[PDB]
Structures are given as structure tokens and as C-alpha cells.
Design a protein around this nucleic acid. Sequence first.
RNA 1: GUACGGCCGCAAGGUUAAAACUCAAAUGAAUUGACGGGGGCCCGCACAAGCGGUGGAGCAUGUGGUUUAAUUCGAUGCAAC
RNA 2: CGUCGUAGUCCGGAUUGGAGUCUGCAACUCGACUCCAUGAAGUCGGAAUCGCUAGUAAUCGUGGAUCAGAAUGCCACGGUG
RNA 3: GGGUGAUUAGCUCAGCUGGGAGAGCACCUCCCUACAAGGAGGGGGUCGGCGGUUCGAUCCCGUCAUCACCCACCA
RNA 4: CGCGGGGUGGAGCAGCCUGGUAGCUCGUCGGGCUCAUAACCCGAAGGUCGUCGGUUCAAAUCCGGCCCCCGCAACCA
RNA 5: CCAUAGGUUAAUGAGGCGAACCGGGGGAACUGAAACAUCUAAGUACCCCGAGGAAAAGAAAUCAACCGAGAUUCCCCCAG
RNA 6: UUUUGUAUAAUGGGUCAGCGACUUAUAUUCUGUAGCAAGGUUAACCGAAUAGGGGAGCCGAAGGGAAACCGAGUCUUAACU
RNA 7: AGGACCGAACCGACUAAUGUUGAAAAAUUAGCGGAUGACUUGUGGCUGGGGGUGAAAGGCCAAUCAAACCGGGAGAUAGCUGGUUCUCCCCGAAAGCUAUUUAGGUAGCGCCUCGUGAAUUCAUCUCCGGGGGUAGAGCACUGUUUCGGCAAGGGGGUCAUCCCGACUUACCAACCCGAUGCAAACUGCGAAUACCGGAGAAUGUUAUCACGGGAGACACACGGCGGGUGCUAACGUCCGUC
RNA 8: UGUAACGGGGCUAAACCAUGCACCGAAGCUGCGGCAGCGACGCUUAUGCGUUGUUGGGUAGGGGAGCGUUCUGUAAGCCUG
RNA 9: GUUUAUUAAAAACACAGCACUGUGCAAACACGAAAGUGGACGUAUACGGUGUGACGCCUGCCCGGUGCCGGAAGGUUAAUUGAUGGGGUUAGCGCAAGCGAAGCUCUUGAUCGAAGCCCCGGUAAACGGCGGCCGUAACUAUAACGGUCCUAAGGUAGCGA
RNA 10: UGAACUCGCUGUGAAGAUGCAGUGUACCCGCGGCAAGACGGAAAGACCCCGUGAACCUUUACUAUAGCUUGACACUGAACAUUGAGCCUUGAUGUGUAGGAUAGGUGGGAGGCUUUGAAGUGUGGACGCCAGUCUGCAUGGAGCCGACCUUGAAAUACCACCCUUUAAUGUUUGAUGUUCUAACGUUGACCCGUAAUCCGGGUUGCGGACAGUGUCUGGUGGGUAGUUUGACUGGGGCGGUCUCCUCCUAAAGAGUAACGGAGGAGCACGAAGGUUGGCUAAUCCUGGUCGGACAUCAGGAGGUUAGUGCAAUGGCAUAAGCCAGCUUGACUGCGAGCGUGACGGCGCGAGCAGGUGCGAAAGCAGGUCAUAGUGAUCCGGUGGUUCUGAAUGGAAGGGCCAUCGCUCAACGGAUAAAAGGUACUCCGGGGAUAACAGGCUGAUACCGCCCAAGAGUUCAUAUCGACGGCGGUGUUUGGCACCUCGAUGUCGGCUCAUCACAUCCUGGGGCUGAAGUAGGUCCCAAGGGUAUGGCUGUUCGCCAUUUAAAGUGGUACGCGAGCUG
RNA 11: GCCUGGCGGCCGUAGCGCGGUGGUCCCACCUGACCCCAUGCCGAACUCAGAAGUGAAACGCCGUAGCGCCGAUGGUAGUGUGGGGUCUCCCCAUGCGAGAGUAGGGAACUGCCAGGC
Length: 50
Amino acid sequence: GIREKIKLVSSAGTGHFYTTTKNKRTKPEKLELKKFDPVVRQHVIYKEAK
RNA sequence: GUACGGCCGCAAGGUUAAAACUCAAAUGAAUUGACGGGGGCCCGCACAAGCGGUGGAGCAUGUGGUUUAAUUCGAUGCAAC
RNA sequence: CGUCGUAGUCCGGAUUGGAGUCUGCAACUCGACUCCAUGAAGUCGGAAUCGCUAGUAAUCGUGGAUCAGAAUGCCACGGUG
RNA sequence: GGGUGAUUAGCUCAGCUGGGAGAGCACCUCCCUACAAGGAGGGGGUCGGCGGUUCGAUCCCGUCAUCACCCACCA
RNA sequence: CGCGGGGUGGAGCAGCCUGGUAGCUCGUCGGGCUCAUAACCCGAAGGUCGUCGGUUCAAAUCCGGCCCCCGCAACCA
RNA sequence: CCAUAGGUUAAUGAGGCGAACCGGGGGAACUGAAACAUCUAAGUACCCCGAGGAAAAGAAAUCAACCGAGAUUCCCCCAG
RNA sequence: UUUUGUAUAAUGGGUCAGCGACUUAUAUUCUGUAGCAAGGUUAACCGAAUAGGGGAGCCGAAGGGAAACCGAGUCUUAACU
RNA sequence: AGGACCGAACCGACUAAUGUUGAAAAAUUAGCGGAUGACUUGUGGCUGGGGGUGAAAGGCCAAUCAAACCGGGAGAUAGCUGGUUCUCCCCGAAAGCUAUUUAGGUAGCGCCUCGUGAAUUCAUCUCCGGGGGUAGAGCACUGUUUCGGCAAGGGGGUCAUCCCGACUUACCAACCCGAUGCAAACUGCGAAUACCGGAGAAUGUUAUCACGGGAGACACACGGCGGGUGCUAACGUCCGUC
RNA sequence: UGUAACGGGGCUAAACCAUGCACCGAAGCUGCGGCAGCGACGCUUAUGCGUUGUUGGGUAGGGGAGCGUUCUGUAAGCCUG
RNA sequence: GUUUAUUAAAAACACAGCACUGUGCAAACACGAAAGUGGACGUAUACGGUGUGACGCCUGCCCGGUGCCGGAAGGUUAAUUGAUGGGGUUAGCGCAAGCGAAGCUCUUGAUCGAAGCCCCGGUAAACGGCGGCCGUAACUAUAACGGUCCUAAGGUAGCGA
RNA sequence: UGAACUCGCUGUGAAGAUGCAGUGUACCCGCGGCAAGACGGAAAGACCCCGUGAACCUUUACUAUAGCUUGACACUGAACAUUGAGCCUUGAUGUGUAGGAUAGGUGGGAGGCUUUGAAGUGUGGACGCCAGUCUGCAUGGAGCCGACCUUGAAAUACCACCCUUUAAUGUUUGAUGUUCUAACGUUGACCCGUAAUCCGGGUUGCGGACAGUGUCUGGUGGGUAGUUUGACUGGGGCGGUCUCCUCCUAAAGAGUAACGGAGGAGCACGAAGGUUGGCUAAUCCUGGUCGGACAUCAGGAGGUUAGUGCAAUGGCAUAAGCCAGCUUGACUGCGAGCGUGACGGCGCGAGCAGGUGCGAAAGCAGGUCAUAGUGAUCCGGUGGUUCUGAAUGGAAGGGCCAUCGCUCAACGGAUAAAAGGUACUCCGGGGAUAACAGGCUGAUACCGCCCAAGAGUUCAUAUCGACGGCGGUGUUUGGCACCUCGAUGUCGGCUCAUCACAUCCUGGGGCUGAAGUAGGUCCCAAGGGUAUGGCUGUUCGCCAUUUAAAGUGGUACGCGAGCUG
RNA sequence: GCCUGGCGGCCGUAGCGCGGUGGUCCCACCUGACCCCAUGCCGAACUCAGAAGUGAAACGCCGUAGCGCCGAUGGUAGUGUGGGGUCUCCCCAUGCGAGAGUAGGGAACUGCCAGGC
């Protein structure tokens, strides 16, 4: 809600970028959670946003 | 040196100019103090600047204020506590 | 000489009871001196301002007056300067 | 008549969580000095009428009395 | 009609919005300068923050009630 | 100065009028979009000019698609 | 005629007479009906102008999927289902 | 002499009367306003529509003007007011639930019917049963409130900050408890009826389903009962049910 | 406006009431004369009949018939000076 | 004097007078597709315009807004020009999809560059506008005076229901 | 000019009846006069509302443009300076600075060069911070240098090489400023047309590279054009309302009304999410130094009363409330499937393929206790992609799959997107919508009674009267919409009626707080009679005064085919 | 037959209070712990090695009704369907109908299994 979008990059080759809207108004720390992508199907590591 | 009309003037104003009401002055010449917020001569540490301060703490002793049944009068900077 | 600090202190002992000591109708209230105990304030201090020129300022003891019984106030004395 | 306020000393007006009356001026007395002015002490209270409550109404409720103000035909 | 503000030790307003929290210039009394009051510099005392509550860990502010004020204003059968 | 503007004359053409279509210039509004401004209505209505039996178009700087067609125009399809 | 509603003063009617409104195209589709039937049809053209000639075109018997592609199946999909 | 006063010609309208199917789409009378002037008048010319002309009125421009007169576009446009013409039979509606750039426009669903097919179709009643949460009832619980009991808290009054503060009061008043209660937004609880399903007894000039053609319909009136609403007024307004 | 608030006349039980019995009163109930239409049962037909039941107020709308008239044909006809 | 021909006859409009201002002449200005006219056969005591209204008293403030007069440093900024980056093609590289120079070529838009705009003084006989609250003087009262909030100014003079 | 044979009244009444109900009354008809009625006659009515009407008018509504104006460009040339930018030809810049020492900078560093040349003191020209450089005579005639020591970022044979500022010569260019002139002008003259009131050509004078104009472009632009100002507002309006969400109204079957009742939502949390096992409030009492004041850890009472991201509501330990460990299931494709609405739309989920997490395991995990936190279509750009890509090889382009973006919130998006004036008003609807006579109603007003604390000497009621109760008239003013806007004309002035009686006067009775006189009051009675001025439009009201008395209400608040304005 | 435990089926007539009784099988307390497991400290909690001591407490069994709980019968509120009466209420005919209260009940029911005496 009215918050800045930034997409996470994959540490490897991936066709998707997970879109984060993470609040950075009290937490400057990075978000790293792992997500599923239907191509390699062995989970993707997503990094560097907000 | 003035209200309302004359007379002049663009106008102001000039010209003509008092009364009612009312009070101890109004006015010209000189003089003793006081005194600068004048200018000069003198002076006090006033100035210059030195060594020491008060007010706060504790204690003691006076003066005022205020209340109540008493909580005294005078001093009025220096020239009173 | 011994001893001690930036600590409201070794200190101070201002305050509060209990004991007494003195003088005196009488010290409860308003007096002084003492002891076992307890125990607070003071580490410059308001706007702003005070005072004299050397034994003067600054500073520590001694004495007297008043007085039955107490001053730190009153009048004097000398030391350091 | 209605509405909004005021209604405390003669003339003008502050109060107080209901404990109790007050100042200026006047009518007086003393202090400061002959007075102004000032300080202090007094003289006089329907705190408007009548009900509700209370042991008590400046600080409450109703109903009135009076004053300043407002209401209103024509639209 | 309908709309927008103000109410803060005694006076008149900052403060509020942005939460870690009660004020300024005067006023009153008492000082400092003085022979003295002003001008001026200091010291001191006192807020139902209109006021009853709500809400919160927490305010005068958030916020409803009960009152007091102003400004725009009555520009429609 | 020769010339030429100006002036004179002759020969021929143009002018003006006409029904509709047509070529060049100028060119709406209402209407539909369920509003309304792009779009539509519509280069239509109407006005100016010119011209022909028609105007226009024309004998590929055409297309087409590596395979081919072979000036133009009008009608039917392509295709709602 | 007109509205929930009309004795209604609510609009229309002097009277006769004459007049006074669905006509008409194309494209499409359903419904009815009829020929023909997995078939049914020609446009412009021109003609023995309702016949006949003219198959370019049109609809129907195949669908599924952006599309490539596949087909009584297809797309979706990891996949029979 | 005269942007003076009188006043006929001429020019012009302050009042009263006449006239507006009047003689007339501006003329008439009786008292008049002006009358060598910024006068008035005979005659011709020049100025044209979103433009003229105007000591400048949406005045004047030939009866006409917030764009005149004539023609063309034109048979403008009108969710609106309206005009539509002999005899007859069968079946027979709707005014509810929604949306809109939406309000007398339009639209989905809803009942009626024509076609063809199926059907003891479909409903009444009984038996069996589910959601119930109204009518009503109750008061622990949520809100709320009358009268009392015990007793904090707050205002008022006094002393304090030592006791982990008491004392008091012609105010206000919580937590809890007893008596008594009200309730749509409370529940210790809780119908008659209604609805719909399961099954069955009884029955019919057909009750209905499904697919394909046409639809039609929401401006509603009056009044109880159940309630809001107004004044438990209205020939007043919103909604269930008849 | 004029009685006008028994509908009028007129009222004394012609008002009101209990219980009972009779009466008037429509297209309802009972009948007579008709038009169209229909279920059951039984027989019969390229469709009716009997026995026995039984329906017809209707706007919106849906469906399905009848009469008249213009014109052309029917019409070189038929009717007729 | 002028007027809404038929509801207004006037205080309106005009007008003597006035301020402010534009205009140096091929004037400014007006007509208007643009010439040629009109201004004017005039030339700064000549011509244009606005408003107010002859004659006598005279005629204040606010430059915040908006316009006009004047000013140019600093910043925003167009046409123009076409830096750098992406693509095609071409030389290049390799076993390949693909990568990859100049020039050609499409694209992106670096830099260049003015006025207005952001600016600042003058101008209100330029348009336009020109305040509340409270205290305070020998009963009551009022407030010349002051306190305060506040603005671009707080509306002077005169006149005043 | 429906027909008519058309009487008055009371009531009913689409609520103002000749025609309905009830009832009363009346010889018929010309003729001259008078004039209530036909909601009389003339008018597609003024005012109000409505209409996805109409014109004209305005501009902090929307958009554009002629014109004016900025710059770029050209028609448009010459020269120089002023300053650059561009630029030729020949030469030249160079020291900062320490000791010797003028080292420009910089890369290289024992090999390398001159005979048309240097040497040395003499003259002389030039650049010069005087260290030296450089031509060239007097003049002769191939050398000469460096290493180590040494300054300094850094050497000094020798070579590649870069730049400063500028004169003179050559010169591109946009401006500034003069000058010149062929362009251009003449708004001068002269010559001729013409012994022409147009201006054509020519020659001269004087200006002079501009005016003017078209393409690009910035600015401004009502002069000119085109357009709107949403829907509801129990007539119009100010304020409110428009999407989502709970409890209730809402009818013991469901959606649900009225500007109905109590409130909220446009977000929050990567943690406040997933999961294993646990845990259990709150509040109050007791007691414990530094302790104003709630402070600790333990005990007791006690509990669907704590808490739940936020609102209202329902629930609560099988905890959905909080505590420790570990974690991504805030998953991708689907799905036994099941709901709700007329539709678009929108809620739940067992399970499986792939992968994941917690757990011993069962089991659970694609977000949160839960109901709200919303925004399609079309489109400007963007990664993946042979799916496709108009002659085909590429690209660009079209699509798919990832994707960024509206407060379009008037929320289901008529459009990214729009406000005002009209008494010049016009046109069509509407009484289906307003004030107005009537009706309904009687809240309001006016008025009667019941009750009667108190007033009034005593004393309720002579004359008054509280707090309240029960009614009346239509009688003021409110409420309705039932008749009108397809004409039913308003205020004051005035000639003129008539009915009612809550009676002003007389006529009659009763009481008194009535001795007499004179007033106050009540019920009983309707016959006549019931006044004049100032200011003002005045009704009215105030002011000034009469009379035996100068009353009140009803009649479309009687009285414009009655007059006045 | 009775007892103690469990799986339960059931969870307001097994509940609240009041008075007795039991260690045998069982259980609770309890013995011990740096051993498995554990305290964000503590063997409290939960373990692990168990019987020395009890029945304190908790637990089971049993009595006792003042009550939660169970609760007739009748009536009342309420009402479907017809109708009466100047009528948002009253009255009736016919068909239904609570909650609360009263009489009264009541200190749990029941199937399977192991062990005990």
C-alpha cells in the first residue's frame, strides 16, 4: 500500500524476479527467503532488495 | 487686529475695529541669591588603577510589613535601621 | 613536626532529647557552662555595585565596661603586614 | 406577550466549587501634612418577589417584576 | 440556513498538527539604578489548559457532551 | 541615339446564356457516437472559375514474388 | 381522451361534407411453410429476357489451439484420468 | 447681435381624454415643451448582418432583431405532448429481486402464451423432520435503570507526607450484594404459524417440467395486523402480510 | 346563503334489547329456451354417438377464424334499356 | 442639447473645463487577405485616447496582486546541430546458434541558443484596495493617552441617516 | 355554439354539482335598464421545477487558433575594428627553487654528429629575467662529449614528441560598431509618357544590407471558434449521500426500505507468516534496603472477566490469546469439489504431480481467528520467445509468458479530461413538483371544563390563579398533495351586501371584595344602530379626539366583464 | 459379588456444601540422582535408577438434600383459522401453546478388559 516496489535478483539463471514491497521505514536489513520457480524446480535463492 | 454688514481685491486679507464677561496686573530700567543640561579657574581619589569586598551558608542584632488581645515612638539617603 | 583532599571533608557539631554545673523568689519561657549520644548547612555568593594612598588596607590574640547571673555588640591593647 | 442578558451597599460593580459578604465614590474617624492624593478603621445589606430542596442558595431549578436590546403587517 | 476558528497560573496569545511534554511578553508583590516613580535589569508566587467525561502507557491537543465568543452570513418556494 | 513604353489599324479568337454530369479554388450545420471536443455527417449542401461530349484515367519509375501477369475505366466478386 | 382517481368546470367535439397513418429497399437471422437434400445456389453479363447460358463467388456437412501445429478430436499438463 | 423671453410656420410630447376587431399594426382633441440653432427641412448620394448607424436604447436598419428579411441544407432535432379507421372465439399476465452516465430513457431475472415432447403431472392434508430465535420469557452474561445494603474514588473541610495516610461532610458516587426490572443491536432460555425436504392416504375437463417462437410488467390507490414515521395527527411517508 | 349534525316526513316503541317464528330482496340458490367447447366409461369412424360428469366477466400479451371494399383477373361471359 | 417610434424624458449620455499618457512625421492610430486610403493638404500651442464634468473649495494612502515603463548578471528553455548508447549490414572470430570495426543506415538526443518565465526599482488623475480587542481622568460616564493582536495600507480632508 | 326541457338550498364529491342524495320553491314570454355566474370572454399564461432542451452573455471551467511577439533561415553585399570560434605562412614562449647550474614537460639512454663549420676578442644586428641563443665577418678549418662525485619528482651526448600566446602575410564566421554601395528604397529632383490629381521606365540626389515576407520555433493570445457545470436532495437549496465491511432494524425461508440505529475500510505485519512442544490470564490482597510513586520474587483469592494489528460483532485452554526451538507452504500447475448473485464479479477446500518446512510420528503447512484494506478495458515503455514477422535474409512490427502505471473513488471505469449569468429570455414537459381559496389534520392558535398551592382582610373559586389532567372551534399559523400553472389576476383606496353569535349598545335576570353614585363579572337574549383626523401605499400601528354604542367571526381572509394603480 | 485402574460410551438430576472411610491390588505423595533427560536459576517441571516412610494432601469409596440439576399436572403470556364490539384494543368459536413457579425427584449411568480379596 503506497510502498516502493523492488524486485529480488536470483543468484543464478532464473526468468522470474520476485517483487518485494518490504517496508524499509524501521528495518534496513535484507530479505532472503527462497521461492519456487517451475523451470528447474529445485527452489531459487533470491537476494538484494530493500 | 475681532463676530456681521459696507468698500477694495481672484481669494487670503486689507480697510472700518468694540462691547458683554472679568482680574491684579500689564510695561520700561536695574539688583541679591541659586545654578548649567554654558566656558573657565579651582577641588574631593570624583577620575586614572591598586589591594581588599557585600549578596549565598551558619549565627547574632536592629528596621519595615502583616495579623491578632498587646505585638510601641521618633528618624526619612549622605544628614535614619 | 606528625597528618590530610577536591570527598558537604580528619572536619563541622548548626539542630533534638536525657543528664547535670552556676547565679538567682525564678532560668518552663527568653540565661550561661558541661558530658555520653545523635546530626544538617557551607565547595563565591541576584539584577547590580562598595571603599582608601602605609604601620594604611589586610589579618590573630589580650584587656575592660554593663554585671546576682551571659555577648559575637560598645571602648581600648599589641603581634604579622 | 415571547427571546437574550442583568438583577450584590445609596451611585457603579468584583466575588464563590453553599459558610456567609467586598472595593471605589459618598456619610464618618484616625495616620501621613494645611490640603489634594495615599494608608487604616467604621456606618448600611429584601445578594429582587414567590415556590422546590437544604439545617444552608453570589456559585441551583421553576415562576414572576423591571431595564437595555431584539421579534412584526406589508414579502 | 450552512461553514470555519478561538477558550492555555491574573491579561492576551505561542504551544498542538510532528506524543516522551506546561510557556512568553506583561500583571502582582519584593529587589537593583535613585531623592523618588516611570523607562530598564532581576527575584518570587499561581494553571479544574472553559468544563463533564471518553481514549491511550501517555496531553491542553486525540475526541463526544454541557457552555462562552468571533468571522463569513440569511445571497430560496 | 537605332530601339521601345505610349498611340493607330486590320485579321481572327475570348467574353454571354444554357439542363445534368465533370476538372481546379473556397466549403458547413444538423445527424450518429444514445452526453461531447478526435471520429462521423461530408469535399456532401452551397458559392467562384473553367471545360468536354463526357470530364477523369492511359500505353508501366505497373505490379507481382523468385512463380507470373502485361495501358485506362465501369460492373460483379475478393471481403464485411 | 386523460392519471391511483373523473357527475366532474379536466383537455378535445358548431354542424354537415370532403380529407386524414405502415408504404418501401438491402444485408442478416429465427419462426412458419414448401421444393430439393449432403447438398442447396449463381453475381455482373446477355438471352429462345419468368425458360436457357454464365461456377467467379456463397452457405452447409469439423472441430480444437494466440500461432506454429494436430484432427473426430484438440488445448490445457506432471499427467492415463 | 443673441446655443435669451413671447409666438404663427415648422419641430417635439408633460398631463387628461379618445383610439388599438380603430378611420389607422400611431392617428385625434384640449391645455401645449421648443422655435437663427449642438435647429429643422426638400432632393440625391455613401455605409449592410456577427456588419452598419447611433450625444450609443439589445435602440434604429421598411410592422420584424440576445443577429432582421428571402431561399437552400430541410421531410432540422424532440428518451416528450400527441394522430391511426368492420364482425369474433380460446388461454390469460405484471407492478416483485437487481444494475445503469441513472430517474416519464434502458437493461438481467420474474408471471402469460403459441409450438413439439414427457408426465397421477401438481397441490391440499397427514405422518416424520431441519434451520430456527420473532411472539414471548429470563436477568448469571452485554448494555441499561429504579429503591435499598456494605463501602472505595472525586469535590468540599482539617491535620499530614511516619508508614507505607487517616479523620470528616446539610454534595456526587464505583466494585459487589439484597428487593424490583427493561431490551432491536443482551441471552440461564423460547411458540403458534411459516417454509422446504422424506414418505403416504384422497383426487382431477391439466396441475407442471424441458427445449424452440412472441412477450407483457416496476408511477401505483385505500385500510387493518406487525413496526419504523408524524403528534401511537392527516384524504401524510417506508416496509412485511392480507 | 336556507332548516341543513335523524337523508326527509314523522317518531314514544316506528328507538333499543332477549328469545322465537314468518316475509322482501341479484346475473348467487332452484328452473325453462339456446350457442360453442370438454374429461370418464362403452361402442363406433379415414369421427361421431350414448350413458355420466362439466366450462365459457377479462385488460397487458400470445394464438386462430368471419364480413365488406378498391383494382386486375375470372368477363369476347352473365344481366340490360 | 440627446433618448429606449406605443409603460422611463431624467440626476443618465453629451458638454465648457481637467489630469495622466501616447505620437518626431513615411507620426501614433484606424480600415483591412493588401494595397491604396483616412489621420492631414495638418507637423508638437499638431494629432490620438481614457475617465471625470462648466464656475468657485479642492483632491490623502497601499507597489502585496495584475498590467505597464525600465533593466540586464545568474537559472529554467524551442527551432537548429547530432555526442554517447541499442539495432541492421559489412571486414573480423570460432565447430555452431551467435558474437563483431570504419563506412553505409535506423534509433536515442550529449552540446549549442533568444524572448517570455524565475527576477528587481518606478507607477494606484494604472486597474484594484485602504482593521479589530482592551485598559485609562476626584459619584455615573467617556477616553485626548496607552497596552495588544495585526497589514500591502489600515480610508487623510471634507461631508455625514 | 357536447346535447339541452339548463330553478334555490344542504350534503355527498377528482373534496368550488342545474344534472348524485335529501329538500324547498316557482304563471309563460317580449321590451327598456341593471350585471353575481358560465372556475365568462383574448392569449400553447407571467413566477417555480424538470429536459444527457435553445440562444445570447461572462470567465482563477476545458481545448485550440488568427494576431502580436523571441530566436533559427533566406532574399542579403563589401571593409575594418571590437572579442572570440575556425584558420595559413615564418619564427618565438619554457627561468619556478636551494650549491654549481635558465634542466619547459616527457618516453628512450655510449653511442653519435658537423667541413656552406666552431674556435675568440673585436665590431655589429636580433630574442632575452643576460643564463645564453642565433645568422654572419674579422677568421681558420674537425671536432667534441660522458661515466664517478653532485642538485632535484626528474639531467646536461643524442633522438621521437606536445603545448602557451602573437606579429605580419593568407582567412572562414555570427554578432557588436562605423564606413562603403552594386542590393533595396524614394514616403526627393529631373527627363518622357502628359503642356494627364494612377505610377511605368530612365537619370540623379539622399538614404542603405533594412523595411517586407514565407518555412521552422519559444512566448502570449476572447480578437475568433467548439464544448461542459455527473446522480440523489419526500418542489428548488445550504449541509449530507455514491465503493467495501460487522452487530441490529429485516418480518422464528432469503436479498431488503426511509438523509434508519452503533462504527469502520483505501491499510498493517517479511514479521505480527509456517510448524513441534508447551504455557495460561486480568485484577486485588500479603511481605521484602537504597524508594516521592506504580517497582522484585513468593503466597492467597480468582477466571469463557486477560488478550485478539486496526472497527463492530461472535467465539475462546481441542486455545484462534503468548512462550521457546526450527523454518518459507506470503509455493508453481491443478483440484472430491462446494458456495452466492439476474449478470460482470467474488468466498471456502479434501487431494495429487514437483519441490519445500515443522514434527518421533500421526498430522499440518500455497500467509495471517474471521468478516473490509479496492481499481477492469484500452494503452506509453520493458525481459523471455522463432509462436509469428507482407519479395526473403535480418530487424522493426503483431501475439504469447513474464510486467511498471488511474483518488477513472461519480468506485459496474458514458471522457486521462469542463465552471458560471439570462427580469431579453425562448422552447417542450409538470400540478406526475411550490406558495394560493377548498378539503383532511388540529401539532399551533384561540377557547371551555376538571384538579386548585397561592393571591384576594378572614377567605381557593366576588375578581384572579400554579403544577398538571380532559376536551372544544375551525379560528390564526403549521403538516399532506388531493384541483389548478392548457390563465381561477395580487396589496392599499371604496359604492354595495348577507349569515353566524364566543353580544358593542339597548332588552332581562343573578352575584360582587355592590351601602348610595359608579364600576367589575356571569347567562340570557339578534331587533335595529355600531364615529372622525396627523404620518404613511398603508391594512396596521403610534399620535390627536368623539358616541347611548362606536363588538367579533364566516361568505374563494364577500367586493378589477367594479372603478382607482 | 464387591474392589482398584483404564479404553471409553456418555459429560448440568456425575455439580456446591457438610460428615465418615481406605493402602490390598492401584495411585499419589515419597527414596536417590554430575548415571538417560533437565532447569532460560532450582530434580519446581519433566526424566531415570526405585519402595525406606505414609495415606497428610490429591485420589477413591460411602452417608447427608439446604441447593445448581431433573420436574409433573393445571393455569397464564402467546397464537394459526373464523368472527363479534365506534375497535392500533376488548370479546368469542374452533385448533394449537411456553418460560417461570408448585407437588415431587435427586448425592451419576453403562459396555468391555486387567488385576485384587
